[PDB]
């Protein structure tokens, strides 16, 4: 029975794709978010029943996936994205998102939780503001569409 | 290479004698096309449903 909850800052992302799963710089990210699902419904009122109304299920919606890094000047991933965006040529991929921990029985790094993200393709790309008077890092941000995600049980 | 819409103008009703052509400077975003068929819809007395007869295509 659990006594202590897990920690959020040890994680990884894997691209199961063209040949990006073996490229080391393609797994290192500063931030990952957007993993949430929502059910959308409608409301129906029945005459004579004044104590409650009926909520009926309609459809399912998912959030976009957002990744943030320091700027990498030569990236195969960015070539894939810009091929989709400039030449209207898209080729969706599959992804894995992992939450990691230390297991020992000496010790080893092992996955703790894994999600499969199915049919991802580019949505948005951006780079942060250049300012002559601030100490900052050039940070690039990518946003992706996908169909759904599942737990690797 | 980007292709453009062209309108060809003919004098012959068999479309053999070309008079000219015009090319659009900006292609349209969309266009629409419409179809229809015509049937006869007379019905017999105290009858449930019907089987219509074909008249023509417009």
């Amino acid at each position: 029975i659990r006594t202590y909850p897990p920690v959020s800052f040890f994680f990884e992302v894997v691209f199961q794709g063209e040949n990006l799963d073996k490229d080391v710089v393609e797994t290192r990210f500063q931030s990952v978010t957007g993993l949430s699902v929502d059910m959308q419904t409608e409301t129906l009122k029945e005459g004579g029943e004044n104590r409650f109304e009926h909520i009926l299920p309609v459809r399912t919606k998912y959030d976009p996936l957002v990744l943030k890094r320091g700027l990498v000047n030569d990236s195969q991933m960015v070539k894939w994205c810009m091929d989709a965006i400039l030449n209207f040529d898209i080729r969706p991929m599959n992804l894995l998102v992992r939450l990691l921990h230390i297991e020992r029985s000496s010790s080893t790094i092992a996955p703790l939780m894994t999600w499969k993200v199915i049919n991802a393709w580019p949505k948005k790309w951006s780079v942060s503001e250049f300012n002559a008077e601030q100490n900052s890092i050039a940070v690039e941000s990518l946003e992706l569409n996908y169909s759904y995600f599942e737990t690797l049980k | 290479a980007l292709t453009k819409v062209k309108l060809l103008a003919y004098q012959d009703k068999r479309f053999e004698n070309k008079l000219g052509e015009f090319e659009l400077p900006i292609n349209p975003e969309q266009f629409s096309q419409s179809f229809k068929v015509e049937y006869n819809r007379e019905q017999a007395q105290g009858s449930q449903r019907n089987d219509p007869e074909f008249k023509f295509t417009k």
């Binding site: 073996k22 490229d23 080391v24 020992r104 000496s106 010790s107 790094i109 | -």
Partner: protein, 480 residues
């Protein structure tokens, strides 16, 4: 190309586009014959004897051309014209094809071209003499070049692109000397090619006889962990150099026997009064010849790419080759069974084509394939990298007083380096204390008398990981 008025000038050329790269770990040395070899005001080939032997550091194909020239003419190119006609002789169709009967053994230029096409970086060139139309290759010149390359410290890989034209005894002698100095210097690795029967077309199962012949070479048993061997030769897309009047023309009609014509290409050139239509046909035919090279320079380029992308501790296998049309031989699984594992341990890696993928390198094992520690290429390359960097880091401490303070200083340096290497993911373990250990001390690693002479002894241990080769799938019927 001399200009005096400021402005913009126009020229028309034909060549292959260039490519360059930045490489830190894979610095190879190529030994062979060249065309020019002139640097500064010294001609290395000015005398027929007393040749100047010295390596030169090159970063691009343009720099190669600046010092060494390009190539020589082939003299063995033939073109056959096939005419389809009727009984009366009226022509109905005409086609042409080109062939080479015996290529020249001097091929450094094409090898360098293939090397740079596959992602290579800076290299050292050592010339052993001028290229010549007799095609003579001598063991002594190559061994002198190998003896000279011993004086440059950055060299990591040894390549002899012309070794396949050498007889078996001389081949064994050369490779034994290369392995011996790799073992003596402790920081180099050797890449080899397999000798194939020089027949056209190559018969079935030639690879089995070639492997059997290789197994019988006399090579030093305890140095076989310092090299690797790849097979077979590769057909690529580059062109041959030739002289127009040296090309021989043949004709054949309705599938009959070939007949040698009395003209060369120079007799069809319209500038000399020839038939320019057939001349254009012949030139198009000649341009279509594929060029056949040994695999080693492409392997070296791929080593450079793999270290830049994945890391040196990963296997340099399962990677596609560039500017390649096709392997000359097709190798199956039942044949590779005796190439990857063999009682002698002399493993041979294979270049194989896979559908929808292209031509891949398959196998990453050394010539010591039965050794429980040194089977795999990546483990030895990683150990060499780590040892040379530790050596460079420790060198500033020579001539220091032999006391506890210097021992502390060198120990701290080594632990810091190995910690940086653990952080990158090259060493196994969840914590630094599980990945390595470093020790030095009196009556721990050294002795009293040792102190009196000037020697320091440090003991270092490191933990690494090894790859998986076999994946087994099992199927069954699920109950509905």
């Amino acid at each position: 190309s001399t200009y005096k008025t400021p402005g913009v000038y126009i020229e028309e050329i034909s060549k292959f586009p260039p490519s360059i790269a930045q490489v830190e770990t894979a610095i190879p040395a190529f030994i062979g014959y060249t065309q020019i070899a002139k640097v500064g005001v010294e001609n290395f080939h000015t005398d027929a004897d007393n040749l100047i032997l010295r390596p030169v550091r090159i970063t691009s194909l343009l720099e190669y051309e600046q010092f060494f020239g390009k190539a020589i003419n082939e003299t063995t190119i033939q073109v056959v014209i096939q005419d389809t006609t009727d009984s009366r002789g009226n022509l109905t169709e005409r086609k042409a094809s080109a062939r080479i009967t015996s290529p020249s053994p001097h091929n450094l230029y094409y090898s360098m071209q293939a090397y740079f096409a596959n992602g290579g970086g800076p290299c050292y060139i050592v010339s052993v003499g001028p290229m010549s139309n007799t095609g003579t290759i001598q063991l002594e010149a190559l061994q002198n070049g190998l003896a000279e390359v011993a004086k440059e410290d950055e060299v990591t890989l040894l390549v002899f692109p012309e070794s396949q034209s050498l007889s078996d005894e001389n081949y064994a002698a050369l490779m034994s000397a290369a392995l011996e100095q790799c073992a003596n210097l402790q920081d180099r690795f050797t890449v080899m090619d397999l000798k194939l029967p020089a027949t056209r077309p190559i018969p079935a199962n030639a690879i089995v006889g070639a492997s059997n012949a290789f197994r019988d070479l006399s090579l030093p048993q305890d140095n076989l962990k310092y090299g690797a061997c790849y097979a077979p030769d590769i057909e690529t897309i580059f062109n041959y150099f030739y002289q127009e009047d040296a090309v021989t023309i043949f004709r054949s009609v309705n599938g009959g026997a070939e007949e040698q014509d009395t003209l060369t290409m120079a007799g069809y050139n319209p500038a000399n009064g020839g038939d320019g239509i057939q001349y254009a046909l012949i030139e198009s035919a000649i341009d279509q010849l594929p060029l056949i090279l040994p695999p080693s320079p492409l392997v070296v380029g791929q080593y450079a790419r793999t270290d830049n992308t994945r890391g040196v501790w990963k296997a340099p296998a399962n990677v596609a080759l560039s500017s390649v049309i096709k392997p000359v031989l097709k190798i199956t699984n039942e044949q590779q069974n005796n190439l990857n594992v063999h009682p002698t341990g002399k493993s041979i890696n294979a270049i194989r084509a896979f559908t929808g993928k292209g031509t891949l390198i398959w196998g990453a094992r050394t010539l010591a394939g039965n050794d429980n520690e040194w089977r795999y290429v990546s483990v030895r390359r990683f150990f060499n990298m780590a040892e040379e960097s530790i050596k460079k880091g420790s060198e500033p401490f020579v001539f220091e007083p032999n006391d506890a303070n210097t021992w502390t200083k060198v120990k701290a340096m080594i632990e810091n380096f190995l910690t940086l290497q653990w952080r990158a993911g090259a060493l196994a373990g969840a914590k630094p204390e599980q990945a390595f250990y470093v020790k030095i001390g009196l009556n721990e690693t050294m002795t009293a008398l040792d102190i009196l002479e000037g020697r320091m002894i440090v003991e270092i241990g490191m933990a690494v990981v090894r790859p998986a080769e076999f994946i087994i799938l099992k199927f069954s019927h699920k109950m509905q």
